């Protein structure tokens, strides 16, 4: 069995290997990359996502989210307070202000220590989940706006044509902006490209050990657990690496820098934080190996998780017994 310790693998494809996205994902899996839940892909040196980032300041962040924390430094929840719209240029200035800017630090490990010690005492503002793309239309390789759609994968694998679309989303981050512990909708893959700016630190639990994380989370968030049998679908809970280590949960960590892709694999729980002003782009995708994970994915039916239009068909076709109850949560 390849990669039996479930380490995060880093890949350096040549320009020739960067032509066929599906084929390269399958190659990474042949080497055991999926066992970690997360892989890093460094694009060939010839490749670029677009020519410059000099003209992005007029993108609108219609609903910036202030991420307010409750709990203790290593075990907390966050809620998202909606703020007034602002442009990317306004947001960048805000991120760089004395109130929100990255502190002085020695290296990524020192910054990680400062994040875990101090995150809860601040409420950073995240421009998340903005439909759109920063890939140039002429970028032919690994262009996250030109991937094969999950609807077409389901149709190719299973023969059933379904409604729905699959488009990318932009994330504009600042110091301490946080992504809570989660898997993807329907336990899909994700791919994330860090277009510009400061790094993003990721934490991930191997898919084969995801239920260990879920059991800890039920212990650490006991009211939330009673409220919903899949409350990590709410994307609000944080647990630090120190706490994970104290409770014996297998995980790994890695820092993504600008110009790098990360791939999350089906049922790979992940969480993380941004080091400073940055912009990422991400989208879900599927392969034939995902289908069995989609069929088994948990679902939130309490009403909190509220998701996209396109998840309807996935539930309806892959999970017909759950469909009725899940849809009641959606309506």
Ligand X SMILES: O=C(O)CNC(=O)C(=O)O
182 is in an annotated binding site: yes
Query: Would you say 228 is a known binding-site residue?
Result: yes
CB of residue 297 to Mg ion, shortest distance in Å: 37
With CB cut-offs between 5 and 8 Å by kind, which of Zn ion, ligand X, Ni ion, none does residue 192 bind? ligand X
Looking at the Cβ atoms of 241 and 316, the one nearer to ligand X is: 241
Structure tokens of 331?
């309506």
- For residue 149, the 8-state DSSP code is P
Task: Figure out which of the listed residues 16, 46, 58, 163 binds Mg ion, where binding follows CB under 5 A.
Answer: 58
* Residue 155 is labelled as binding a ligand: no
Q: Fill in the DSSP letter of residue 302.
A: S
CA distance 76 to 236: 8
Nearer to Zn ion, 236 or 300 (CB): 300
34 is in an annotated binding site: no
CB of 228 to Zn ion, least distance (A): 3
Binding letters toward Zn ion, positions 110-149, x by CB under 5 A: ----------------------------------------
CA-to-CA dists, residue 152 to 19, 160, 164, 219, angstroms: 20, 9, 10, 39
> From the list Zn ion, ligand X, Mg ion, none, which binds 300 (C-beta under 5 to 8 Å, kind-based)?
Zn ion
Rounded CA-CA distance 301/328 in Å is 7
CB closer to ligand X out of 91 and 179: 179
Are 57 and 87 contacting, i.e. CB atoms less than 8 angstroms apart?
A: yes
Q: What residues between 218 and 247 interact with Zn ion by CB under 5 A?
A: 228
300 is in an annotated binding site: yes
Residues in touch with ligand X (CB under 6 A): 171, 179, 190, 192, 264, 270, 280, 282
Q: CA-CA distances (angstroms) from residue 163 to 212, 252, 310, 313, 316?
A: 35, 37, 7, 7, 11
Residue 234 · residue 228 · CB < 8 Å: yes
Q: Which helix (H) or strand (E) holds 64?
A: none
216 binds, among Zn ion, Ni ion, Mg ion, none (CB under 5 to 8 A by kind): none
Element (H, E) at 109: helix 108-118
Spatial separation of the C-alpha atoms in residues 130 and 319, rounded to whole Å: 28
Interaction between residue 304 and Zn ion (CB under 5 A) = yes
Taking the complex as a whole, the smallest distance from the CB of residue 169 to ligand X amounts, in Å, to: 9
Only one residue has tokens 């309506």, namely 331
The H or E element containing residue 86 is strand 86-87
- Known binding residues for Fe cation are 182, 184, 270
- Known binding residues are 126, 182, 184, 192, 200, 228, 234-235, 270, 300, 302
- Known binding residues for Zn(2+) are 228, 234, 300, 302
Note the residues at the interface with Zn ion (CB under 5 A).
Answer: 228, 300, 302, 304
């Amino acid at each position: 069995a390849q990669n039996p310790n479930c380490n995060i693998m880093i890949f350096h494809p040549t320009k020739e290997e960067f032509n066929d996205f599906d084929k390269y994902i399958a190659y990474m899996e042949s080497q055991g990359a999926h066992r970690a839940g997360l892989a890093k892909i460094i694009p060939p040196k010839e490749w670029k996502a677009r020519e410059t980032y000099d003209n992005i300041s007029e993108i609108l962040i219609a609903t910036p989210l202030q991420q307010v924390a409750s709990g203790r430094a290593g075990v907390f929840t966050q809620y998202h307070k909606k703020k007034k719209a602002m442009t990317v240029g306004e947001y960048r200035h805000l991120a760089n202000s004395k109130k929100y800017q990255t502190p002085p630090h020695q290296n990524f490990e020192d910054l990680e220590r400062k994040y875990w010690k101090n995150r809860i005492y601040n409420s950073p503002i995240y421009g998340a989940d903005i439909s759109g793309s920063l890939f140039d239309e002429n970028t032919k390789q690994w262009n996250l706006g030109h991937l094969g759609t999950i609807q077409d994968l389901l149709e190719k694998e299973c023969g059933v044509v379904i409604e729905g679309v699959n488009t990318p989303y932009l994330y504009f981050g600042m110091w301490k902006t946080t992504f809570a512990w989660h898997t993807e909708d329907m336990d899909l893959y994700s791919i994330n490209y860090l277009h510009l700016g400061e790094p993003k630190t990721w934490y991930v639990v191997p898919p084969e050990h995801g239920q260990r994380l879920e059991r800890l989370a039920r212990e650490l968030f006991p009211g939330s657990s009673r409220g919903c049998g899949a409350f990590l679908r709410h994307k609000v809970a944080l647990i630090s690496p120190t706490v994970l280590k104290e409770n014996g949960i297998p995980f790994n960590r890695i820092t993504q820098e600008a110009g790098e892709f990360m791939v999350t694999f089906p049922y790979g729980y992940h969480a993380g934080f941004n080091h400073g002003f940055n912009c990422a782009e991400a989208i879900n995708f599927a392969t034939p190996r995902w289908i069995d994970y989609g069929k088994m994915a948990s679902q939130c039916s309490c009403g909190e998780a509220r998701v996209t239009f396109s998840m309807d068909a996935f539930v309806r076709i892959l999970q017909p017994e759950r469909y009725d109850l899940w849809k009641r949560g959606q309506d």
